[PDB]
Write a protein that binds this ligand. Structure first.
Ligand code: NAD
Ligand code: NAD
Ligand code: NAD
Ligand code: NAD
Ligand code: ZN
Ligand code: ZN
Ligand code: ZN
Ligand code: ZN
Ligand code: ZN
Ligand code: ZN
Ligand code: ZN
Ligand code: ZN
Lengths: 345, 333, 344, 342
């Protein structure tokens, strides 16, 4: 069985040959149809030995879809060959958060060493993969696998981030999206679907701002030092109802604070080591909340899939063979994938 | 009338004419002194509203759709009344007030530490009935502000949740009571002073623990691993904020309510739990001030005052700075 | 001035000549640019004498848009010439509900004799009108007065009824809109602008079904006894929400027959004595039911914002003041394709 | 093992020796307590035509127990647990939020609750289908724990649905100070600042209501509507939770509710319905019939029980006393909940 795995700290990932797994009881085995590349995957492989805590080796890929190959003893509700998507942020299933589907915010996960596929558990970047538990499988009917893998993260996360504050984004509101990459271009679209918000996109790259318009953005602003003024220029004196920073570097967060509205929100979603928002009197408008959200909930994934199934999310992808796995990650690193990269086994 | 004023930046306070409507005018029955005034009066000429300035943003009074003689309370953060926020009574978050130059009484408009006062518009008065005005004055801010901050994340504080209250001061101690009125949350109080901790218990707290280095651990030892659903920090110093960050739960909330120039929560990955939101809330909303008055009228709020005469004004202030008033401080005309 | 008025119980409205009024202190006078005919008005004029409570004569029109012509003493906030829409459900201004802008749910209006323009207070079907207080005007800017007047009732009410349960209409949800006329056709577009909901519309009339399709419905089906099974056909076993802008027993019955578990019915349309039957074994578990009234201050602000954004496409027919009475007859007969709007 | 089943339509339940059951996936509990819900004195009144739950049926949908297992772990042997009644599919949109009481796939997949189409809790032992249907109760007294699964959960959910309305100044009306209603009163007080007015038919129930925190107490029947308005001023209750559900309690609820208020019809009277239409109910006042409660809502009730925020009035009975206990419930003589201890 072929797979892409991280094997040495600071080394590139490699194509490997390792056993097809079999499902224990309660487990499901998928024949992987599509596996998404997330930029988080990079942030991991950039960890130094001291910080890295995910086991070696690790089959990569926390964006995952496939078909049911083989059931472990006593699993019901699923038939061999039903098409499914994998809910990534696995949790204990039993705590107060888990009971509401919010397994991303599971209070027990850490203690019980429950880790997401691709992030401590064997990932989706192989021909087959195991899902621990049936409730982490979401039905996707005839949905194209290539366009669906991304929904599990590039979809789920922005959706979550938005769902946190969706009551604010009524008519008149303005939402700002910073970074039109994997999560970014999907962000915009989610915002058109479930809100009346005017959407303003922000990227460093001119072609990415075109992709932004392409997928629904009302206006498109060039990133950097002119950004905040251009945004206010667009929002009138008032500012942006919310800011979804899918970059999360210090400059984009600075821009976020410089633009957000009184009683608004900033979602620091993108990860830059040691970048923070500065929330104190005089540094931010009154009542403007700031959060770093994580992935997304059970019911939220089914909502994202519902969005795809309704033809409301036009996902941008590029396909790679398994052997082009390592190559796909040099491409995401250099920034040359216009959307999400996806590895079709 | 007499009217405790602030006429030279960096000093200490004081006899003005008596103003006229044509608008509403109230015989003041009480005036709260907020720590915010001490913040306003350590403001360099630069940073710093107008002088002369009649003090007091916490005001109740009696009128000197409203009966002459009505006992009423003054909604503080005035705004345009006409934006999206103001239409929802959320005038504390009004977008146009700055640009229209609309300032609260005792904060750019003539305040409550006079004997009579003007209130610009009829909507800024909340009927208090036969509630004792001394006890009511605080409601308007020491009640309003923490009520509003507790109102922003109320649905997270169902049974089994935990709320931490940092700074059992004028505001702190009303907040503790609020949490007990409107939630089933476990309340944990924190403070530097051992007498303030006792205050905390008297008004309902489920535990009160010493502020400092041992605070984070002591809090976690009562919450278990999870931490605290909501931290409301009424001190807002960097040390209190650091504590809050170290105890909050995943999917929790931090409300930075106290003001220390240059203190901030640092919100970013590794420095705060996932899903833990932070906000600096400001003052409160119209319907919120009614809700506060409703709690008082039901006997659900036991407000600790200490009365002052129109004259004892300036002395009343130095005691606040000194940390020597147990609860609020109220000036009566 | 020229105005249309209900002058005699059970008679038709007539065009009359009455003095142009003048703002009291606190008040605004408007030069009316547009006035909306609402079916509620017909309901009102159908009332028998005993029920009828709004005084005589009464100047019709509870949907109104104009420009500021005269400020009463003490009124700031507005400049003469400003374009404004009239918030209708006037309230006391001070009560717990009013302070949140929900003057439609004011608890003191009844007691105080505070009634809406055209529904106890002289309406907007005249050359000029009086609005009692400045908070009841909402700026419209350059918005076409003809497509703006319906926002005051025909937008505001659907917007509200939808607001009450919006967290229900996530991706995957379905909403039914029964009755694609004045409110109905606007209710469709709102659902599409502010929710991911799939939208099925329902009407007796085949032209109206097209209108629904034309303004965004994902589907459109014929009202009547066959209507439920066809809605169910579209959904599978049902409908997350039903907004019934007809509110007749037959439609309500359909409504209950198709609402999802933990869904909702908004009974918006008014048929005298028609009611939902909410009780065990007659409605799914969790399915809530409410008769909403009008909408809220911020709500109207928000509806106005939707128009300005170009997300609401309002279908209208224009009438002079004299065609007033003739336009009401057209409404009763059902020959207006959208909202009838009078331009003084 | 001994158990108390309904075996003959129209006939009182009976006590029987049947085999102790075995776990599949499943989990077996030594029932430490089994609550009696007036809902059963409904199911048994069902005519042979509408009754659809199978014969014979171990009665009892409020269970609390001690844990053998199924091949499924996460719970240890002898852990104390409460049982989530309204079983669902665990896979639909409602079930992913934990809202199994609103599971859509349950009637198709023919999934029924214990005591309600599946084997009950009124026995020495019981089967539980899946883990997620077990709630840790820790060291709580099982007699007081059992009513929480239903007499607790049902009112908590009914209240949860509209809690935001119930701020300081709000008024809540509880009709029917019985099993559900007297926990209803206490929940209202723990999680809100609403002023509680209880209504019942009999003085001793009105006593019970004050005993559990009711701000005020009303004699039910015609005079109620007026008596309630005398206490709300001419404004009426923000909320009315009707644990009785008869046309008259419902009627009363319409005549007292506030503009933009809520009526929750929780009691089951066969044919009784609210009449939601213009001129018959205030603008903006919502009605619903809610069903049981959610997984996270049961963790929330347990938490309330655990912090001494609830006092659950019960009378104990043994396995043999069961049948006679229902007669009690029917004639309405139990002060709170009847609970069974094997
Ligand atoms: N919060 C979560 O639960 C979670 C989940 C998934 C991803 N993430 C993080 O979100 C980030 C985005 O992920 P992705 O997979 O979409 O990466 P990506 O490579 O697809 O995104 C790159 C995009 O961001 C733009 N960009 C880079 N720097 C910018 C700048 N300073 N200003 C404006 N735009 C800039 C790029 O030009 C490009 O359009 C990553 O850091 C990832 O780790 C977090
Ligand atoms: N956010 C707003 O819109 C707004 C409105 C009003 C007041 N405030 C602010 O809230 C803060 C408190 O207000 P107050 O008037 O009740 O003050 P107060 O002086 O009456 O209360 C101070 C309390 O805090 C305690 N304290 C000081 N430092 C502490 C620390 N390190 N750890 C624990 N306890 C500590 C003191 O022992 C005392 O009990 C002030 O900074 C004030 O400006 C903010
Ligand atoms: N709830 C409120 O506060 C509020 C506010 C404004 C208007 N209304 C009421 O709402 C209702 C709608 O008013 P409008 O002005 O939009 O009416 P309208 O005359 O403009 O629209 C009538 C539409 O309903 C359709 N219709 C009639 N019977 C039908 C049936 N059995 N099935 C499907 N469609 C049917 C007609 O075909 C027509 O398209 C009226 O009853 C009006 O009085 C209520
Ligand atoms: N909605 C749900 O999912 C659900 C769940 C559980 C129970 N229930 C139903 O709720 C109801 C109450 O259950 P219970 O076991 O607590 O009943 P109970 O017998 O334990 O209590 C009944 C109480 O209501 C009082 N009462 C009777 N008629 C009255 C009236 N006219 N006005 C005021 N009070 C009156 C009685 O005196 C008694 O105090 C039942 O109908 C039951 O089936 C519904
Ligand atoms: Zn990722
Ligand atoms: Zn968990
Ligand atoms: Zn203050
Ligand atoms: Zn404003
Ligand atoms: Zn109307
Ligand atoms: Zn009012
Ligand atoms: Zn029951
Ligand atoms: Zn289900």
């Amino acid at each position: 069985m072929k797979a892409v795995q991280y094997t040495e700290i600071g080394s590139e990932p490699v194509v490997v040959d390792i056993p097809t797994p079999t499902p224990g009881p309660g487990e499901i085995l998928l024949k992987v149809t599509a596996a998404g590349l997330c930029h988080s995957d990079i942030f991991v492989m950039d960890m130094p030995a001291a910080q890295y805590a995910y086991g070696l080796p690790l089959t990569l890929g926390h964006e995952g879809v496939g078909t049911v190959a083989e059931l472990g003893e006593g699993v019901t509700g699923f038939g061999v060959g039903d098409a499914v998507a994998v809910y990534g942020p696995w949790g204990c299933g039993a705590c107060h958060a888990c009971a509401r589907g919010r397994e991303n915010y599971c209070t027990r996960a850490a203690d019980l060493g429950i880790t997401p596929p691709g992030l401590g558990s064997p990932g989706s970047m192989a021909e087959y993969m195991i899902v621990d538990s049936a409730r982490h499988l979401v039905p996707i009917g005839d949905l194209d696998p290539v366009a669906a893998a991304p929904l599990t993260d590039a979809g789920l996360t922005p959706y979550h981030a938005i769902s946190r504050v969706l009551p604010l984004l009524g008519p008149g509101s303005t939402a700002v999206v910073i970074g039109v990459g994997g999560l970014g271009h999907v962000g915009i679209q989610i915002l058109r679907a479930v809100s009346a918000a005017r959407v303003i996109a922000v990227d460093l790259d001119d072609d990415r701002l075109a992709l932004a318009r392409e997928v629904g953005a009302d206006a498109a602003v060039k990133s950097g030092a002119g950004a905040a003024d251009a945004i206010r220029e667009l929002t009138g004196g008032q500012g942006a109802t919310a800011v979804f920073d899918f970059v999360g570097a210090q400059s984009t967060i600075d821009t976020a604070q410089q633009v957000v509205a009184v009683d608004g929100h900033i979602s620091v979603v993108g990860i830059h080591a040691g970048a923070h928002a500065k929330v104190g009197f005089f540094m931010i408008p009154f009542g403007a909340s700031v959060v770093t959200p994580y992935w997304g909930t059970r019911s939220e994934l089914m909502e994202v899939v519902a969005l795809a199934r309704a033809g409301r999310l036009d996902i941008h992808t590029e396909t790679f063979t398994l052997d082009e796995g390592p190559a796909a990650y040099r491409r995401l690193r250099e920034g040359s994938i216009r959307g999400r990269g996806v590895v079709v086994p």
